Structure 1
Amino acid sequence: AAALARLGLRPVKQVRVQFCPFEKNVESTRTFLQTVSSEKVRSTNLNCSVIADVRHDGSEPCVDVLFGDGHRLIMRGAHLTALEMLTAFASHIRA
């Protein structure tokens, strides 16, 4: 979270987190939400909009990231660790 705080969310304009709470394989994505929805990272720019769209219907967990440019980052965190997702996100932001 501190690493993401240092590396501000300048290029990204929108982030969306979708998960099924009853599903056993969502905890990672939930952790990701916990990291991305903090003041330390959110107060870098108010251009970013964090949306949490939690659903009950059986579906694969996934997070969506919209950049200012043509960059588009979707990743399914069903079998992805939170730390791995954060590192990948940071690398994509670096561009």
Structure 2
Amino acid sequence: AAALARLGLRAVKQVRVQFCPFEKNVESTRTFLQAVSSEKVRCTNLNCSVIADVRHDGSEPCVDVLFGDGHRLIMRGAHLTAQEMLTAFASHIQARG
């Protein structure tokens, strides 16, 4: 959550996280949620909304992030680890923006 704060999230439009709480594989995506939801990252820009989509049946956890490059970054955490998602997020959404 700190490495996201240092990186100036203001280049982002909308961040949603779609996941399924009763699956065994979702801990990673959750960790991502609480990393982006933190006060530092949340207050870097007020133009960005963070939406948590919670469903029992969907069965596939997902993270979708739009930003003002006209870019859409969608990472499906299934077997992906938390800090791999956050590193991918950092190098992807910072270097472009």
Which bracket does the TM-score occupy, shorter chain normalised? over 0.9
**Partner SS state of residue 34, structure 1:** helix
Measure how far apart 1:82 and its partner are: 0.5
C-alpha distance after superposition, 1:10-33 (max 9, x if no partner): 211100001100000100000000
Structure 2 gap ranges (5+) = none
User: Is the 2:19–2:58 Cα contact (8 Å) retained in structure 1?
Assistant: no
C-alpha distance after superposition, 1:37-71 (max 9, x if no partner): 01111100001100000101142110000111221
In 2, distance between residues paired with 1:68 and 1:58? Answer: 28
**Partner SS state of residue 29, structure 2:** helix
Structure 1 gap ranges (5+) = none
- Number of residue pairs matched? 95
Q: TM-score of the superposition, structure 1-length normalised?
A: 0.94
Larger % of strand: which? 2
In 2, distance between residues paired with 1:71 and 1:92? Answer: 10
User: Is the 2:60–2:78 Cα contact (8 Å) retained in structure 1?
Assistant: yes
C-alpha distance after superposition, 1:54-91 (max 9, x if no partner): 10114211000011122110011111000000011111
Moved beyond 4 Å, runs of 4+ = none
Instruction: Report percent identity of matched pairs.
Output: 95
